[PDB]
Paper text:
The vesicular monoamine transporter 2 (VMAT2) is a proton-dependent antiporter responsible for loading monoamine neurotransmitters into synaptic vesicles. VMAT2 is expressed in all monoaminergic neurons in the brain, including those for serotonin, norepinephrine, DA, epinephrine, and histamine, and is essential for loading these neurotransmitters into SVs. Sequence alignments also show that SLC18 transporters belong to the major facilitator superfamily (MFS) of membrane transport proteins which use an alternating access mechanism to transport substrate across membranes.
Here, we report a structure of VMAT2 bound to TBZ at 3.1 Å resolution in an occluded conformation using single-particle cryo-electron microscopy (cryo-EM), describing the architecture of VMAT2, identifying the high-affinity TBZ binding site, and revealing the mechanisms of drug and neurotransmitter binding, inhibition, and transport. After successive optimizations, our final construct contained mVenus fused to the N-termini at position 17, and the anti-GFP nanobody at position 482 which we denote the VMAT2 chimera. The structure of the VMAT2-TBZ complex reveals that both the cytosolic and lumenal gates are closed, which precludes solvent and ligand access from either the cytosolic or lumenal compartments. We find R217 and Y418 form the outer cytosolic gate with the guanidino group of R217 involved in a cation-π interaction with the aromatic benzyl group of Y418 which seals off cytosolic access to the binding site. A striking feature of LL4 is the location of W318 which positions its indole side chain directly into a lumenal cavity near the TBZ site, acting as a plug to completely occlude the lumenal side of the transporter. The TBZ binding site exhibits an amphipathic environment, comprised of both polar and non-polar residues where the tertiary amine of TBZ orients itself toward the negatively charged surface of the binding site near TM7 and -11, and toward E312.
Numbering used by the authors: 17 to 47, 119 to 476
């Protein structure tokens, strides 16, 4: 039982965090051109930036400690610091709550995302199994961002009060209970002692090319989402029906990307899904400067969400293959590098990177984050055969 059931646990533990981070979307409206939103965004920019820096600064401290504690207690902090955040939103009268309420969730996201991916890395040892399995587990992000806003928005308008958080606190304790049974995560058990120290993974070039590819893929969508024309007009008229829908294309395309390139990327060679993984991000972003209508953003969202899925699902199992080929196999830490790289685009990119566009115009910030991705694609020639220890 245990091998296969931990995929269902880590899928659900990624789904609920990725649904919870996204159900705040139709709530945000309570607080001349499609990219001028860079200037209106700054309040919303801080809601994307806060979760991702508090999650990012935590990744070394969860990833390192996972080796000392054992995996199960970090996954339980992943359920729990995210659950107490779910309950916190249920009486958020002001932005303050939202901002801090997010901060607690960031820690839960780390606790869940690093230790859960390390649990799949530890448990699924063969590359074909680990590719199919991590592609399906990363399908938790892709299903969470899709499922969450349509459900959250319909409850927020039709049922009212703060209902979309109480019904999610119902589903989060169901996952927490299923962890208490399936993992038996109430015991103190350490991992193989004094394994690879993170500075030595960070000084090996071959892990950086994979982590960098996971980061630079996310950076293209991280500048885009905070500054969509989705926040101001929606209060006034029946166009509010678009408030939850705008992520649906990027989050169907991620699902098919992480699900298909969970199986196919192993077979063709995963390096070609960083090369054709960031060529597609870059060219999909490069259609944004020719949009002048929100419908014109549906096409570039779909190729970004697909290509994010093709990179993540191909490069997350490369983290495991590299510690299995150049280092010592304790995955408490390498997934700390992979997850800060995933996360950092949302931490840094919206606000610190948003300062680029205001002096220049925003179609230049989008076109350049596009080229930085087509230029990264040939750098993965180092991942054809990482030379053995
Ligand atoms: C309201 O806040 C947030 C909203 C959203 C995200 C993150 C947020 O906060 C940090 C995720 C993060 C991801 O994983 C990407 C999934 C895509 C490729 C389908 C992009 N966006 C989708 C919406």
């Amino acid at each position: 039982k245990s091998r296969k059931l931990i995929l269902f646990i880590v899928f659900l533990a990624l789904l609920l965090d990725n649904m919870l981070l996204t159900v705040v979307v139709p709530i945000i409206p309570s607080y001349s051109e499609d990219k001028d939103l860079l200037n209106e965004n700054v309040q919303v920019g801080l809601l994307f930036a806060s979760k991702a820096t508090v999650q990012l600064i935590t990744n070394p401290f969860i990833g390192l400690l996972t080796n000392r504690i054992g995996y199960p207690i970090p996954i339980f902090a992943g359920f729990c610091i995210m659950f107490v955040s779910t309950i916190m939103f249920a009486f958020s009268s002001s932005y303050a709550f939202l901002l801090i309420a997010r901060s607690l969730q960031g820690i839960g996201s780390s606790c869940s995302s690093v230790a859960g991916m390390g649990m799949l890395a530890s448990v699924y040892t063969d590359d074909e199994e680990r590719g199919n399995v991590m592609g399906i587990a990363l399908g938790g992000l892709a299903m969470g961002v899709l499922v969450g806003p349509p459900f959250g928005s319909v409850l927020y308008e039709f049922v009212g009060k703060t209902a979309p958080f109480l019904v999610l606190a119902a589903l989060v304790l169901l996952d927490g209970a299923i962890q208490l049974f399936v993992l038996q995560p109430s015991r103190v058990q350490p991992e193989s002692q004094k394994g690879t120290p993170l500075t030595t993974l960070l000084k090996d070039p071959y892990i950086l090319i994979a982590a960098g590819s996971i980061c630079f893929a996310n950076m293209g969508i991280a500048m885009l989402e905070p500054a969509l024309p989705i926040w101001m007009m929606e209060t006034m008229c029946s166009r509010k029906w678009q408030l939850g829908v705008a992520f649906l294309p990027a989050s169907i395309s991620y699902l098919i990307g992480t699900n298909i390139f969970g199986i196919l990327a192993h077979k063709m060679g995963r390096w070609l899904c960083a090369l054709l993984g960031m060529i597609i991000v870059g060219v999909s972003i490069l259609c944004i400067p020719f949009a002048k209508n929100i419908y014109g953003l549906i096409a570039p969202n779909f190729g970004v969400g697909f290509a994010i899925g093709m990179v993540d699902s191909s490069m997350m199992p490369i983290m495991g293959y590299l510690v299995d080929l150049r280092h010592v196999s304790v995955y408490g830490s390498v997934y700390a590098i992979a997850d800060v790289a995933f996360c950092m685009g949302y931490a840094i990119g919206p606000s610190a990177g948003g300062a680029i566009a205001k002096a220049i115009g925003f179609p230049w910030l989008m076109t350049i984050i596009g080229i930085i991705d087509i230029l990264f694609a040939p750098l993965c020639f180092f991942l054809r055969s990482p030379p053995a220890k």
